[PDB]
Amino acid sequence: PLMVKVLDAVRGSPAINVAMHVFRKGLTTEEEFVEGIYKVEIDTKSYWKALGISPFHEHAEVVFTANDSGPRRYTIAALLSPYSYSTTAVVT
Amino acid sequence: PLMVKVLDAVRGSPAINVAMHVFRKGLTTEEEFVEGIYKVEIDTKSYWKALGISPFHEHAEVVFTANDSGPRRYTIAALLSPYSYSTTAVVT
Amino acid sequence: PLMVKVLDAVRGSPAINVAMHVFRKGLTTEEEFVEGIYKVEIDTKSYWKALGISPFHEHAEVVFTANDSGPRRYTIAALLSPYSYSTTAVVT
Amino acid sequence: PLMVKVLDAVRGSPAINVAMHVFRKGLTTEEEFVEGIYKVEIDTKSYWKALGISPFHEHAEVVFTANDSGPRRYTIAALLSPYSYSTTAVVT
Amino acid sequence: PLMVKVLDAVRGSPAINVAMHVFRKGLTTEEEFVEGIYKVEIDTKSYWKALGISPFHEHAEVVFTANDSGPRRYTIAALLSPYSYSTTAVVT
Amino acid sequence: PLMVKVLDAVRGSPAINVAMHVFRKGLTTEEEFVEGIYKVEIDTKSYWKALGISPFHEHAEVVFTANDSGPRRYTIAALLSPYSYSTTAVVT
Amino acid sequence: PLMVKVLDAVRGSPAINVAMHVFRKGLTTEEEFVEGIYKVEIDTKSYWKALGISPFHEHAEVVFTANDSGPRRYTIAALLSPYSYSTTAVVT
Amino acid sequence: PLMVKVLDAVRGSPAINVAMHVFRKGLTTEEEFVEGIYKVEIDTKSYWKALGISPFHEHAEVVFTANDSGPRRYTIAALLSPYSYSTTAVVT
Amino acid sequence: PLMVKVLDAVRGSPAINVAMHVFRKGLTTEEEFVEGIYKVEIDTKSYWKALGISPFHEHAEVVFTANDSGPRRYTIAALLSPYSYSTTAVVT
Amino acid sequence: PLMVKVLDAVRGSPAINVAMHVFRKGLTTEEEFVEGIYKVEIDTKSYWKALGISPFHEHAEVVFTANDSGPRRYTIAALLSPYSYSTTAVVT
Amino acid sequence: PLMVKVLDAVRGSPAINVAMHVFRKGLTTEEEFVEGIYKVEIDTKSYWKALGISPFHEHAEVVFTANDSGPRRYTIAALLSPYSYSTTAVVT
Amino acid sequence: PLMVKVLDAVRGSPAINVAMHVFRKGLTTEEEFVEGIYKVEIDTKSYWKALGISPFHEHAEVVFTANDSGPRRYTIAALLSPYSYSTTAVVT
Amino acid sequence: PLMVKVLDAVRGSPAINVAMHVFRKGLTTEEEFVEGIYKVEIDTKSYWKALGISPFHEHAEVVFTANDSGPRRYTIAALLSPYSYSTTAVVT
Amino acid sequence: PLMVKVLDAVRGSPAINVAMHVFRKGLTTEEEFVEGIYKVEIDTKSYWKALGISPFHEHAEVVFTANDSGPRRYTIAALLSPYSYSTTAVVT
């Protein structure tokens, strides 16, 4: 007799971010990547990746180089932040 | 007797972001990538990726180079943020 | 006796972003990419990707180079953010 | 006895983005790409991609080069953001 | 006894974006690409792609070069954002 | 006789971030990456990764170099912080 | 006879971040990475990682170098901090 | 006052093999082959020869195969052997 | 006052093999082959020869195979052997 | 006052093999091969020869195979052996 | 006042093998091979020879195999052996 | 006042083997091979030779294999042995 | 006043082997091989030889195998042995 | 006033083996091999040899194996042994 009641009545003007779910029940490589409900990626970097069985097995000569420079100003505000009657401002 | 009641009545002007889902139930490589409900990717980078069984198996000579520069100003506001009666501003 | 009631009555002028779904019940390579409900990709980059069984198996000589420069100003506001009675402004 | 009731009555002028779906039930390569409901891609880039069984198997000599420059100003507002009675403005 | 009731009555002038679906139940390469419901791609780029079984199998010498420059100003507003009684403006 | 009642009635204008989910029930490599409900990644970096059985097994000569410079000013505010009647400001 | 009642009635304007979930019940490598409910990663770095069985097994000569410099000013405020009637300000 | 006197007088019937000589005094490839005085080549073989600057410079894939069989009976006698009053015989 | 006197007088029938000589005094490849006075080559073989500057410089994949079989009976007699009053015989 | 007197007078029938000489006085590859006076080569073999500057410089994959079989009976007699009044015989 | 007198007078029938001579006086590879006076090579073999500056410089993978079998009966007599009044015989 | 007198007079039938001589006076590789006067090589073998500057410099993987079998009966007699009035015999 | 007198007079039939000579006077690799007067090589073997500066400098993996079997019966007699009035015999 | 008198007169039939000579006078590798007057090598073996500067400098993994079997009957007689009036016999 499952039952879920969220936010059954709302008099007013909220700022809601609702997420949910109700559940009721030889050689091989694999990359499973299952994502979620909310996500905010900014400037994500995944430079190098070698995935599998026996990569670079013999005599592999790998030269990696990742120089990072440059003034990266992330002036951020109100991420995943539902607001009400509020004043979000970004100035420069 | 499953039952889900979300936001059954809303008097007013809310800023909602609803997401849900109710459930009731030889050699091989594989890349499964199943996505979610909400997503905001900005400047995501995945430079290099070797996926499979035995890549670069023998004598692989890999030279990688990722120089990153340049002033990247991310002046961001109100991501995944449903707002009400509010004032979001970005100035420069 | 499954039952879902979302937002059954709405007196007013909201800003809603609803997403849902109710469910009731030899050599080989594969790239499955199943997407979701919402998505906002901006300047996404996937430079290099070698996917499969035994790529670059022998004597592979790979020279990679990714220089990144240039002032990329992302002046962003109100992504996936349904708003009501509000004032979103971007100025330069 | 499945049943879904979303937004059964709406007195007013809302800005809704509804998406749903109710469910009730030798050598080989494959690229399945199933898309979803909503999507907003801007300046997406997928430079290089080698997909299959044994690409570049022998003596492969690959020289990659991706220089990125140039001031790319993304002045964006109100993506996937149904708004009501609001004022969205972009100035330069 | 499936049943779906969305937006059964609407007194007013809403800006709706409704999408739904209800469902009730030797060598080989393949590229399946099944698309979604609402979509907005802008400046999407997929420069290179080699898909199949054993491409570039032997002695493949591949020289890639992607220089990107030029000030690309994306001044965007109201994507997938049904609005009501609102004022969307873009100035330069 | 499961039962969940969250936020059953809301008189007022709250700034809520709700997330929930109720549950009721030879050689091999694998990378499972299942994501959560909320996430805000900014400037995440995963430079190098070698995942699988016996990578770099013999005589592997790997030279890594990651120089990091450049004044990165992250001037951030109100991440995953739903606020009400408030004033969030970022100035430079 | 499970039962959960959170925030059953809210008269007022609260900034709450409610995240909950009720539960009621040969060679091999594996990387499981299951994520949680909330997360805010900023400038996370995972430079080098070599998970697997017998990586670098013989004669591996690895030279690593990670120089870190550059004045990174993280001027941050109000992370995962839902506030009400407050005043969050960042100035430079 | 050079002077050479060979075999100045010969009373008799000699079998002579006389040979003499008295002497008194950018990119480029070259094969000089100056021969001498006497020579008896039999079944000489020079199967393969790549002569020059940078032959087979790149990706050259050369498959060579020289099977040698067959009963080659060289029943030889009196090569470069001037005889006198003698009896040379070859029988089978 | 050079002077050479060989075999100045010969009473009789000799079997002579006389040979004499009196002397009195950018990129580039070269094969000089100057021969001698007497020579008897039989079944000489020079199967494979790469001569020059930088042959097979890159990725050269050379498969060589020289099987040698077959009863080769060299029944030889009196090579470069001037004889007199003698009896040279070869029988089978 | 150089003087050379060999075999000045020969009464009789000798089997002589006389040989004499009196003497009185950027990138580059080279194969000089100067031969002499007498030579008897039989079944000489020079299977493989890479001569020059930087042959097989990179990634060279060379597979060599020289199987030698077959009864090779060299029944030889009187090589470079001037004989007199003698009896040289080869029987089978 | 040089002077050489060899075999000035020969009464009789000798088997002589006379040899003599009187003397009176950037990147680069080179193979000089100067031969002498007498030589009898039989079944000489020089299977493999890499000659030059930096052959096989990088990643060279060389597989050599020289199986030698087969009854090789060298029944030889009187090599470089001038004989007189003698009896040289080879029987089988 | 140099003077050389060898074998000035020979009454009789000798078997001589005379050999004599009177004398009176950047990167680089080189193979000088100067030969002498007499030589009898039989079944000489020089299987493998890497002669030069930095051959096989990096990651060279060399597999050598020289199996030797087969009854090789060298039944030899009278090599470089000038004989007189003698009886040289080889029987099988 | 040099002077050499060898074998000035020979009454008889000697078996002589005379060999005499009168004398009166950046990176680099080199193989000088100057030979002598007499030489009898039989079944000489020089299997492997890496001659030069820094061969096999890095990560060289060399597998050598030499199996030597097979009844080799060297039934030899009278090498470099000039004989007179003698009887040399080889029987099987 | 140098003077050498060897064997000035020989009445008889001697088996002599005479050998004489009268004398009266940056990085680098080198193999000088000067030979003598007489030499009889039989079944000489020089299996493995790395002569040079810094061979196998780093991580060299060398596996050597020399199995020696096979009856090798060296039934030899009269090497470098000039004999007179004698009887040399080899029987099997």
Author numbering:
A (entry chain J), B (entry chain H), C (entry chain F), D (entry chain D), E (entry chain B), F (entry chain L), ...: 11 to 35, 57 to 123
What is the paper's account of this structure, in its own sentences?
The human plasma protein transthyretin (TTR) is one of more than 30 proteins known to cause amyloidosis. TTR is mainly produced in the liver (90%), and it serves as a transporter of thyroxine hormone and vitamin A5,6. In its soluble form, TTR exists as a homotetramer in which the 127 amino acids in each monomer fold into a β-barrel structure formed by two β-sheets (β-strands D–A-G-H and β-strands C-B-E-F). TTR fibrillogenesis follows a downhill polymerization mechanism, in which dissociation of the TTR homotetramer and partial unfolding of the monomers initiate the amyloid aggregation cascade.
Here, we structurally characterized vitreous body fibrils from a patient with ATTRv Val30Met amyloidosis and showed that they are polymorphic and mainly consist of multi-protofilaments. Using cryo-EM we obtained the structure of the vitreous body ATTR Val30Met twisted-dimer consisting of two intertwined protofilaments. The model was built in the cryo-EM map at a spatial resolution of 3.2 Å (for statistics see Supplementary Tables 1 and 2 and Supplementary Fig. 4). The ATTR fibril proteins in each protofilament had identical conformations related by a twofold symmetry axis (C2 symmetry) along the fibril long axis. The protofilaments intertwined along the C2-axis into a left-handed helix with a helical crossover distance of 154 nm, a helical twist of –0.55°, and a helical rise of 4.72 Å, as determined by the layer line from the power spectrum from reference-free 2D class averages. The continuous Coulomb potential regions in each protofilament were modeled with two fragments of ATTR—the N-terminal fragment comprising residues Pro11–Lys35 and the C-terminal fragment comprising residues Gly57–Thr123. In contrast, each fibril protein in the twisted-dimer has 11 β-strands (strands β1–β11). In particular, two additional shorter β-strands (β6 and β7) are formed in the twisted-dimer fibril protein as a result of rearrangement of the sole α-helix in the structure of TTR. These structural changes convert the 3D barrel structure into an almost flat disc-like one. However, the major structural difference between the two fibril proteins was the folding of the first 11 residues of the C-terminal fragment, residues Gly57–Ile68. In vitreous body fibril protein, these residues form a long β-strand placed diagonally over the core of the fibril protein.
